[PDB]
């Protein structure tokens, strides 16, 4: 705690500790299709189903995980099915990502032709 507060980045370190839980919960999605809240708050060491409920709810609200809570059974159901690429809006994403590369290549050509005509780059 002395080094982390002498360098003034104390508070950016506690974010790593808080992010470890959010990383473990996301790692639960690669093995499970339906988990119990009491059972879930024993592998990520959250110590309580009540706190695991809000930990999952916050991650759902931020678009970090794809899941749904069931307070009746008290179980978290992982969906893991965001998108199928047949949307007329994904075409917009591909178009924008293509236009950015087109502009980048145009810039590269522009600052390449300025070297092609350099009088110093004719003697070597």
């Amino acid at each position: 705690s002395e080094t982390f507060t002498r360098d003034n980045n104390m508070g950016l370190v506690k974010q790593c500790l808080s992010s470890l839980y959010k990383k473990n919960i996301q790692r639960l999605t690669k093995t499970f299709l339906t988990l119990s809240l009491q059972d879930m708050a024993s592998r990520v060491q959250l110590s309580g189903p009540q706190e695991a409920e809000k930990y999952v709810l916050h991650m759902i609200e931020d678009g970090e995980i794809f899941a749904s809570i069931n307070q009746k059974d008290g179980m978290v159901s992982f969906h893991d099915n965001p998108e199928k690429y047949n949307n007329p809006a994904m075409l917009h994403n591909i178009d924008q990502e293509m236009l950015k590369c087109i502009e980048l290549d145009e810039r590269l050509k522009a600052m390449d032709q300025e070297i092609t005509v350099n009088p110093q780059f004719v003697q070597k």
């Binding site: 690669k30 093995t31 499970f32 299709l33 339906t34 988990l35 119990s36 059972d39 059974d73 179980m75 998108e83 199928k84 690429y85 994403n93 990502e97 950015k100 590369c101 980048l104 810039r107 590269l108």
Partner: protein
């Protein structure tokens, strides 16, 4: 429970030489069989062996039980030296006659008495003289077995592999077929179940099994090496863990050569044949029944942990292979375990790319998942594009800083 579920007489009969003494000391300095078997079994053969003192570390252990061979200790010390003098004088005579082209007889008995004394590779130079004053490859093949025998008690497994490679590669495919119907001598069996043993000690299980399963039961009697029974276990457990189903069927189950080996080891035969037929409820139980009998083996104990874990992981993948939606209750009842521990095992297996499955821990059902090729392709291509644009921007900035020659001076 550690119990003496072995008979010492058959172990003593199978082996001969220093290997028998080493095996007897190994089982002794573990903690089965000592109580009354140890003193009788070990002391019987120390009369003809050297270094004398090997008993004392195990001798005082009888005190808590609450020998008398004290005069014999000084008896062997004075008599050991006499055998060395004649052979030390003998090698001078062989050089005196200048018959070095035919002194191969001189090293015929020179190397055996050295190994009888528990000496070291210092004698091995004589076998080098075999390479220098011989013409036909037959003497080289002869001395290769001797050097392998003396290197077995040397922990020089890589050195053993190099010499087996030399002995198998230098001649023409080991005398081709060996004057038809195989050679009269069984040196092929030794070159097979010595390189396989060395690969086993090198933690190369698949190659060890592949070499050991190719042995022959013609002579197969190896007092200086692993017993015929041990070949079956070494080649069976090492094959159940690394061989695929097709390889298991072609090289083990259908092979006539290994069936004779499996005849005298019923437990391994039943284990293999019930693993193949998808009967894991009792295959694992029989595998566990003999776990505290291979831990007392000298060449297989350290790997018992690695093999038994590797076999089980190969069963779990095989059990969940024809199924698209399996019940975890019957899955756990067929592995002699509980659902709570089976869930941990399956989670560990799924975390790595071994099983493509998802656990439903509400009705306890293991579902088989299928990856969407199109979505995965789109995701990875978009990620690659993002990384490429980031690298392009970084490189352009690097070009700007390099052109302007921006750096921090030492001052």
């Amino acid at each position: 429970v550690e119990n003496p579920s072995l008979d010492l007489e058959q172990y003593a009969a199978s082996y001969s030489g220093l290997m028998r003494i080493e095996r007897l000391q190994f089982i002794a300095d573990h903690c089965p069989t000592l109580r009354v078997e140890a003193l009788k079994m070990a002391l019987s053969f120390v009369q003809r062996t050297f270094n004398v003192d090997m008993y004392e570390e195990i001798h005082r252990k009888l005190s808590e039980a609450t020998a008398l061979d004290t005069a014999w200790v000084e008896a062997t010390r004075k008599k050991a030296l006499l055998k060395l003098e004649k052979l030390d004088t003998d090698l001078k005579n062989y050089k005196g006659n200048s018959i070095k082209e035919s002194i191969r007889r001189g090293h015929d008995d020179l190397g055996d008495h050295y190994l009888d004394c528990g000496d070291l590779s210092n004698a091995l130079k004589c076998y080098s003289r075999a390479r220098d004053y011989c013409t036909s490859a037959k003497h080289v093949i002869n001395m290769c077995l001797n050097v392998i025998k003396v290197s077995v008690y040397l922990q020089n497994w890589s050195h053993v592999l190099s010499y087996v490679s030399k002995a198998e590669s230098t001649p023409e495919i080991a005398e081709q077929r060996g004057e038809r119907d195989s050679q009269t001598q069984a040196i092929l069996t030794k070159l097979k179940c010595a390189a396989g043993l060395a690969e086993l000690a090198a933690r190369k299980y698949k190659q060890a099994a592949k070499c050991l399963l190719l042995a022959s039961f013609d002579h197969c009697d190896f007092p200086e090496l692993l017993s015929p029974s041990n070949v079956a276990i070494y080649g069976g457990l090492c094959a159940l863990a690394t061989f695929d189903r097709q390889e298991l069927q072609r090289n083990v189950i259908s092979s006539s050569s290994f069936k004779l080996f499996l005849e005298l080891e019923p437990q391994v035969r039943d284990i293999i044949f019930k693993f193949y037929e998808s009967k894991y409820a009792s295959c694992l139980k029989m595998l566990d029944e003999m776990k505290d009998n291979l831990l007392l083996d000298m060449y297989l104990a350290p790997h018992v942990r690695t093999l038994y874990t590797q076999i089980r992981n190969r069963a779990l993948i095989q059990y969940f292979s024809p199924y698209v939606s399996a019940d975890m209750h019957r899955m756990a009842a067929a592995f002699n375990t509980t659902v709570a521990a089976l869930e941990d095992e399956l989670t560990q297996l799924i975390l790595e790319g071994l099983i493509s499955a998802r656990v439903d821990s509400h009705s306890k059902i293991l579902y088989a998942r299928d990856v969407d090729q199109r979505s995965t392709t789109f995701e990875k291509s978009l990620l690659m594009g993002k990384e490429f644009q980031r690298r392009a921007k970084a490189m352009m900035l690097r070009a700007a800083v390099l052109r302007n020659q921006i750096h921090v001076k030492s001052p």
